[PDB]
């Protein structure tokens, strides 16, 4: 007769490096309203949220993790956003027999099961860009690839995965270059070694520095193809930076024809998911809940992953259901949830939701190409099913893609 309250311990980055909590806290709040109103999901239970602002800071998050664990009520799951907060909470979690579900962590290191035994994420690993990269090399028949990176853990781990994935396809990494903050030397070294197909892994500020150096060394044109990350701001190369020698037109020349990969966070199809909402309905409903405009709201693109994380949890809790008897000293309930979370298969607002053996989300990637100082959607790739959605919109100098070597 009485619905028992079951609690989620969440952490939302309202500020810091990735202030994703701005759109992810309301998206979670919407998902809890939708799950609790559905009598076919958890009829005997009411899913409740207890949350804190991590400020995208592990030190700050350490204070709140204590607050979540050392105060009543007992929480059945932990929900962090930032990769640094997730590395802290997902490693600690085993001591309290807690499942950890992240809605925003892209760090490849979080795919380690020995270290993060109860970890799941509706956000894919930064390594999800690699199967799409290998497939694009296979499509355009390239077996020799160059790689330039900014010295960060995420980019190092992404390249380490790229290595083992190219070997599987009969492709080899010719030259590997790196920089901490200044990229003149690896760019100079790329012209030196006559590198043609180049995968560049760096943040937006460093991308600008890379591309100004790319200009000077004339590392752009018919001979050159750049593989970059698709989540920079629109017209990132057009953005004014005092540390930049180059001009907007100069940068526009250097960037032309480069390929980007990005995770699909919102289903491009007009279909209805488990919530019975469409992609556009979710976006409309979420905009109404926001104090500021979507463009001024951190983590607006990631918001569907936060929404679907609640559904993944609700569906897992539904597959199990003795939820009130959960204790930090006992594994029994945890183990059943893990099994239910492992076997997740449903349609969310972000698309089909499935986790690999590491607890990492499997999703579509959107392939784009910079055609005339603007990105054009050249395709989509599904890693699990080896399905490449190809649109005849890719454009190259002369009429076709260049080769990896001398020819």
């Amino acid at each position: 007769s009485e619905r028992r309250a079951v609690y989620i311990g969440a952490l939302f980055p309202m500020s810091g490096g990735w202030p994703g909590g701005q759109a992810c806290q309301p998206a979670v709040e919407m998902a809890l309203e939708d799950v609790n109103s559905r009598r076919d999901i958890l009829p005997d239970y009411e899913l409740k949220l207890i949350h804190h602002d991590s400020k995208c800071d592990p030190g700050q998050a350490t204070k709140y993790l204590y607050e979540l664990l050392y105060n009543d009520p007992i929480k059945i799951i932990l929900m962090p956003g930032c990769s640094s907060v997730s590395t802290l909470v997902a490693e600690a979690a085993r001591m309290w027999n807690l499942i950890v579900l992240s809605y925003g962590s892209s760090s490849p290191a979080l795919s380690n099961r020995q270290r993060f035994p109860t970890f799941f994420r509706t956000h894919p690993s930064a390594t999800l860009h690699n199967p799409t990269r290998v497939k694009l090399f296979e499509k355009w028949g390239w077996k020799k690839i160059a790689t330039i990176q900014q010295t960060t853990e995420v980019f190092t781990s992404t390249l380490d995965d790229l290595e083992e994935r190219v070997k599987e396809a009969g492709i080899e990494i010719t030259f590997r270059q790196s920089f901490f903050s200044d990229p003149a030397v690896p760019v100079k070294n790329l012209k030196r070694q006559d590198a043609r197909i180049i995968v560049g892994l760096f943040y937006e500020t460093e991308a600008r520095k890379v591309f100004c150096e790319v200009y000077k060394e004339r590392l752009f044109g018919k001979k050159y193809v750049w593989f970059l990350i698709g989540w920079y701001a629109d017209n990132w190369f057009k953005i004014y930076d005092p540390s930049i020698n180059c001009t907007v037109d100069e940068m526009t020349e250097a960037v032309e024809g480069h390929i980007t990969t990005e995770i699909v966070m919102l289903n491009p199809a007009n279909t209805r998911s488990i919530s019975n909402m469409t992609s556009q309905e979710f976006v409309e409903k979420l905009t109404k809940r926001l104090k500021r405009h979507p463009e001024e709201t951190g983590g607006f693109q990631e918001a569907p992953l936060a929404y679907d994380a609640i559904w993944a949890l609700a569906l897992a809790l539904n597959k199990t259901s003795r939820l009130e008897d959960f204790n930090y000293n006992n594994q029994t309930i945890t183990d059943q949830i893990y099994r239910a979370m492992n076997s997740s298969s449903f349609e969310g607002v972000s698309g089909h939701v499935v986790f690999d053996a590491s607890g990492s989300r499997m999703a579509w990637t959107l392939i784009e190409q910079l055609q005339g100082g603007s990105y054009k959607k050249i395709g989509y790739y599904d890693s699990t099913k080896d399905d490449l959605s190809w649109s005849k919109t890719d454009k190259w100098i002369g009429g076709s893609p260049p080769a990896d070597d001398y020819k």
Partner: protein
């Protein structure tokens, strides 16, 4: 007699390898506590050190810290943190509970970042503290050109990175910078090829034997060469594939080892009224069957830093403790400012901090036939070097030339 509770954090279990550090330092901590109590230095109060086992594990260490806050007394500060990743986790979070931390064994350079670890202090010099000492050694012998040999592991690359800033604006050139992961031979041949004579090595005990074997094969030993490497390796580390033991020892001859000084060599009375030598005898008696630890003097001086900090804090409150919960930002700031005033002569030498970092003593050793022999010491406070007159030796008529 009200308590002044201190949160002791360290590995203590026999099942954990670094449990030997935590156990090896406890007789030293027991001796400092015992004295401070007898003398009633903290009258009316008494020092209440509570021990919690981190087990040298991130998850267990965090729960040990959390459990101490929940079930333990209202601690005024943190004493300890031994393992680098555990200490980093606790040290970053400190301000959340207004807890000042003093470590005696965590030497990771990372902890010097006061933007990330503002409430963290340490009585032990960090791994980077050898770099100003090496600079003085290079200046002393007129070595203006050096080569570097580093292992591609964070512990060593942190040290090499700091060297760049220490040698900048100084009359010293790094002619060749070489890195290795598993085999040093390629890098050792590149060093030989570039005619490098003075080598600053940063690598582990296992790689050192490989380095010296490559040095024997490349003839990068004798009168024309000086290897300056870590001084923290275990004794007889070389004894423990292509080279013969005699060939390894020939190439090892004359290497300079650099590390922090475990205890002061000065036969002067410290804050406790005992000389470092007297303290060492008292420690050796108290330890019994427990294996000694090189961090014992730092743990001993650490207890004195706490007692002296609490004294200064008590004075500051009297110039205007029980009510302190991890809520009192003011008391945390009082304790913070009091620890920054630390200036006394302890068993490890003069105990002074420079932005939470210890300004201490760096030991120089030289491999002479069968073992490492102390050849000198660097005083970081004075920025001075003292070479022991008739100990340090060279195979030639003069010390080697840098080119």
């Amino acid at each position: 007699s009200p308590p002044l509770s201190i949160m002791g954090l360290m590995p203590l279990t026999k099942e954990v390898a670094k449990g030997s550090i935590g156990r090896g330092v406890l007789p030293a901590v027991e001796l400092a506590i015992e004295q401070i109590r007898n003398e009633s230095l903290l009258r009316p109060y008494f020092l209440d050190l509570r021990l919690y086992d981190t087990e040298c594990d991130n998850a267990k260490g965090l729960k040990a810290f959390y459990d101490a806050i929940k079930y333990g007394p209202n601690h005024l500060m943190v004493f300890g943190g031994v393992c680098p990743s555990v200490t980093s986790i606790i040290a970053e979070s400190l301000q959340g509970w207004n807890l000042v931390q003093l470590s005696f064994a965590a030497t990771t350079p990372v902890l010097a970042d006061k933007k990330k670890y503002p409430y963290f202090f340490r009585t032990v010099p960090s791994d980077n503290a050898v770099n100003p000492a090496i600079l003085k050694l290079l200046k002393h012998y007129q070595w203006k050109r050096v080569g570097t040999l580093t292992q591609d592991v964070q512990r060593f690359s942190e040290v090499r990175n700091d060297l760049t800033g220490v040698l900048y604006g100084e009359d010293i050139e790094i002619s060749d910078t070489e890195s290795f992961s598993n085999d040093p031979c390629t890098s050792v041949k590149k060093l030989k090829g570039n005619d490098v004579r003075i080598i600053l090595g940063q690598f582990d005990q296992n790689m050192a034997a490989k380095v010296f074997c490559c040095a024997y094969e490349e003839n990068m030993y004798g009168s024309k060469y000086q290897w300056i490497i870590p001084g923290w390796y275990e004794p007889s580390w070389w004894e423990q594939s292509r080279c013969l033991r005699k060939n390894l020892l020939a190439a090892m001859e004359g290497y300079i080892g650099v590390d922090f000084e475990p205890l002061s060599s000065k036969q002067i009375k410290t804050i406790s009224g005992k000389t470092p030598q007297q303290y060492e005898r008292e420690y050796n008696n108290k330890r019994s069957g427990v294996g000694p630890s090189k961090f014992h003097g730092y743990a001993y001086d650490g207890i004195w830093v706490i007692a002296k900090t609490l004294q200064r804090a008590m004075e500051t409150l009297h110039a205007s403790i029980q009510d302190f919960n991890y809520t009192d930002h003011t008391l945390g700031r009082i304790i913070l400012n009091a620890m920054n005033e630390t200036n006394f002569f302890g068993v490890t030498g003069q105990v002074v901090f420079r932005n939470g970092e210890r300004m201490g003593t760096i030991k120089f050793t030289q491999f002479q036939d069968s073992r490492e022999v102390k050849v000198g010491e660097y005083n970081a406070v004075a920025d001075t070097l003292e070479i022991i007159n008739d100990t340090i030796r060279f195979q030639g008529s003069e010390p080697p030339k840098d080119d």
